Ligand binder design. Structure first.
Ligand SMILES: O=C(Nc1cncc2ccccc12)[C@@H]1CNCc2ccc(Cl)cc21
Ligand SMILES: [Cl-]
Lengths: 299, 302
């Protein structure tokens, strides 16, 4: 029993964190095989092609623990700088670069000066921001998932927006959301709640003995989406209904039946009651996270 | 900016997780140097669980009865001893991945990271606190026994918890790494109930300071309180008494935000009386008590 915001074990990612210095700027890098990936703003209205051409290999000071790595090449791919090094990381795990969709969750290994300080779980918001916990020096910290023995790198931190939310790229340097890597007026779009994730978390609560919100009613997918759109909730698709199938089978509560519970929860509130120690509806657990935690999958 | 329930990077602890098998029972072990630490109930059956005599059961065991597996490698047990509720299995190989470590026994209110494991394999990491009733509100299924709680301050891993059991209410009980249980719990299937839980007052105050540091001031008020009047109010909401030690510990946060501890105490009294009124504090509609004053400083400063 118990339901916690749980991150993947960070060990495979810790062995890849390095410190990258260029001039006055010091941030984090991801060392995989003989390449160190880091945000391109480490070289900093910036013209990154112009700024990078002026740099030489010895301008980049890469430090892996108490060992200095020597940079033998540098190239830019979108908003990520790829620093070719002489040494291949012996601790390189089996990995992939994956781009995630809004609503998907991942673990963040927050780092400062190439040293991991913490690990937390979070979700890619529908407005493409992440509600992270980042201070100055965290740039280059990465988000990941583990599937079996493979580390899927899905995020690299670049910046904090004026509202305290974070913006970053995939490992190919493509930003999530309509952001750019420069000091300019940028604002996160109006956020929405990840509906499929709230439903998955309602199933996790049922699996844990919390049934007070359940009701005899069901709804059509159309009537649910008309209500959900009114409360700034993401539309629930048939793909989402299909993905919730295993949880629906395990608890004996049809997806549209659980939608009627959510529909009532939105129009009436919790009324002093809590679901899994929370007075708010939680949307940072996907249907897979719930299955993985309530079944105990290992890595 | 931002405030998250953050766990320590689990890497240093992952390299210590092994699977321990004795008869039908399979749980987790902590492999540090040439010793594997695991709950002593690994020697028990379910029929010898109401009133097990562990000295008697252990004397009947030999080294080859304990099957220790570190990854896809079987470790050879060369000795076994019991220290309180923990079994210490001497092995013939010292763990090459043994980090700098300490065994620390924590007090209620303290937080730590849990590396939940099944069959010696890490499945997840989460942050939690030692409840004032000495239980932990973990996320554990059968097979998680032997999973450990830790803090990684600087380069040293401080092991503070080893998971032993789940109480009938879904909460968890375990020991420090010396096998001494936290709380009045025993490693027996006898009737055991967690005492009435209470809110870790010093931690709620620290989390209110974290919210101030992050620009959230709506809950602040022009009032202050005596420590005695605060505790009389706090007790009525099932809140732990705030001591002078707690007031002293909150000193740095009080200095950083310019809000006296007894001033923040008056905010908390008001929150307890009024509720949040549809508002949130650090994205939470409830008062959070699983961040210590030390966690807040570390996350907001370093
Ligand atoms: O509690 C225990 N294990 C678990 C531990 N954690 C989470 C579980 C979740 C679901 C089932 C088991 C779980 C064991 C087994 N049950 C009785 C018992 C009695 C005493 C002792 Cl010390 C251990 C145990
Ligand atoms: Cl302590």
């Amino acid at each position: 029993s118990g339901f916690r915001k749980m991150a993947f074990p960070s060990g495979k990612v810790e062995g890849c964190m390095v410190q990258v210095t260029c001039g006055t700027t010091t941030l984090n890098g991801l060392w995989l095989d003989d390449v160190v990936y880091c945000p391109r703003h480490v070289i900093c209205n910036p013209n990154y092609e112009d700024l990078l051409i002026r740099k030489s290999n010895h301008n980049f000071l890469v430090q892996a623990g108490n060992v200095q790595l020597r940079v033998i090449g540098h190239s830019m791919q979108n908003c990520v700088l790829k620093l070719k090094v002489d040494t291949a990381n012996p601790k390189t795990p089996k990995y992939k670069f994956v781009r995630i969709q809004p609503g998907q969750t991942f673990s963040v290994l927050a780092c400062y000066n190439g040293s991991p300080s913490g690990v937390y779980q979070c979700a890619m918001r529908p407005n493409f921001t992440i509600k992270g916990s980042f201070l100055n020096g965290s740039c280059g910290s990465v988000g990941f998932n583990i599937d079996y023995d493979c580390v899927s790198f899905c995020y690299m931190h670049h910046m904090e927006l004026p509202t305290g939310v974070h913006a970053g790229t995939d490992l190919e340097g493509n930003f999530y959301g309509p952001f750019v890597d420069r000091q300019t007026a940028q604002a996160a779009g109006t956020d929405t709640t990840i509906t499929v994730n709230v439903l998955a978390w309602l199933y996790a609560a049922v699996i844990n003995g919390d049934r007070w919100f359940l009701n005899r009613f069901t709804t059509t997918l159309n009537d649910f989406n008309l209500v959900a759109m009114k409360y700034n909730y993401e539309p629930l698709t048939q793909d989402h209904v299909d993905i919730l199938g295993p949880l629906s089978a395990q608890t004996g509560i049809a997806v549209l039946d659980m939608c009627a519970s959510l529909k009532e929860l939105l129009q009436n509130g919790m009324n002093g009651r809590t679901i899994l120690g929370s007075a708010l509806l939680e949307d940072e657990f996907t249907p897979f996270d719930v299955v993985r935690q309530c079944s105990g999958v290992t890595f």
